[PDB]
Amino acid sequence: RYEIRWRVIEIYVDPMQLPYDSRWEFPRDGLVLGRVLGSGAFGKVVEGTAYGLSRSQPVMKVAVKMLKPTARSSEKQALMSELKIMTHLGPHLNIVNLLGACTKSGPIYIIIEYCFYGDLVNYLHKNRDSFVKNLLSDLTLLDLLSFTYQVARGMEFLASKNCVHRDLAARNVLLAQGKIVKICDFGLARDIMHDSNYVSKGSTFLPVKWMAPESIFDNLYTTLSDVWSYGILLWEIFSLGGTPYPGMMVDSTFYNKIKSGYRMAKPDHATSEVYEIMVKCWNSEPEKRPSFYHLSEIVENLLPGQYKKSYEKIHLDFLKSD
């Protein structure tokens, strides 16, 4: 069934034992549902308009997560668990934030931030052929570095909450208005049983091409394994939406080849400094990989100083907005 891939370290936190703060409860007729943004095997994410959800934005475009009407009660529980995890984590500029929920009398709706530009993969495919003050407003290398920095800041936030993503990839990174990057788990809009990014391993389907060796062979997921996935994500960005390990099929050969030390070559549009970051993220020893805090420091030094000021002004607006 559908279940968010995110996990919080307590031994993992059991989301069914977490409380649901009813302050998030939003009346159902305050929500008007629109077209689908992504439809998967267990549910979908649709556009919506929320009335009175924000005092500063009395009429606000949102996104809404929901299951199929045939959802079993155990699938309903999984959606509540994701809802509880999001309230437990709290908000940050660079994650798809929870805004409210409809959990009384009927299907569970999770109301989340609407991201105008969609996922990063489709955004890169849209602007591949076209490849300072307008970086964070409505491609160039600076755009790619802006994406690189904001993902690091978003993952630094998740890491600071002892949260492991476990499916970090460009398909799970959305772009909102102002070119603000927002990490999420968009698995509800996918069918991992019929998606070439997910490979049958054991009794499930896993994003093997994005997974660190310790996650593949030892089922160990840590923030440092997210850093490996972050390096693969950077390959996606600077290849302008390319598929990792192009031409190679995931089989027993692939696992041992990566374990033996094979790594992707530099993407054509990556700088030498950007590729060195990816190489660091792909260290076989997880403790040699840089933390997301250090990654944010490294990438920030690759961007113009005025970008950092523009970022924090947007960040400030986010924190002051209610």
Q: Do 283 and 147 touch, CB atoms closer than 8 A? A: no
Specify which residues 9 forms β-bridges with.
12
Name the pairing type of β-strands 7-8 and 163-164: antiparallel
Domains assigned to the chain: 7-113 (3.30.200.20), 118-302 (1.10.510.10)
Binding residues for ATP are: 37-45, 65
Q: How many other C-beta atoms lie within 10 A of the C-beta of residue 42?
A: 22
Rounded to whole angstroms, the Cα distance separating 159 from 169 reads 16
Other CB atoms within a 10 A radius of the CB of residue 187 amount to: 23
Annotated binding-site ranges: 37-45, 65
- Report the C-alpha gap between 185 and 172 in whole angstroms: 6
Q: Is 210 exposed, middle or buried (0-12, 13-18, 19+ CB in 10 A)?
A: buried
Resolution of the experimental structure, in angstroms: 2.0
Closest CA to 98 of 86, 84, 89: 86
Element housing 181 (H / E): strand 180-183
- Indicate which technique resolved this structure: X-ray
Please state, in angstroms and as integers, the Cα–Cα distance from residue 11 to each residue in 14, 76, 124, 158, following that order. 9, 24, 38, 17
Burial 135-158 (b: 16+ CB within 10 A, else e): bbeebeeebbbbbbbbbbbbbbbb
Collapsing DSSP to helix, strand or coil, 183 comes out as strand
Question: From CA 294, how far away is CA 277, in angstroms rounded?
Answer: 11
- Type of residue at 265: A
- Give me the helices (H) in the chain, please: 73-89, 120-127, 141-160, 213-218, 223-238, 252-259, 272-281, 292-300, 305-320
Nearest Cα neighbor of 173 from 244, 233, 235 is 233
Q: Please give the backbone phi and psi of residue 26, each rounded to the nearest 5 degrees, phi first.
A: -125, 130
Nearest CA to 44 out of 10, 14, 79, 5 is that of 79
Catalytic residue among 167, 195, 218, 226: 167
Report d(CA 292, CA 230) in Å as an integer: 9
Supply φ then ψ for residue 137, to 5 degrees: -155, 175
In the residue annotation, 191 being an active-site residue is answered as no
Contact assessment for residue 221 and residue 215, using Cβ atoms and an 8 Å cutoff: yes
| Opening angle at CA 18, ends 83 and 230, nearest 5 | 55
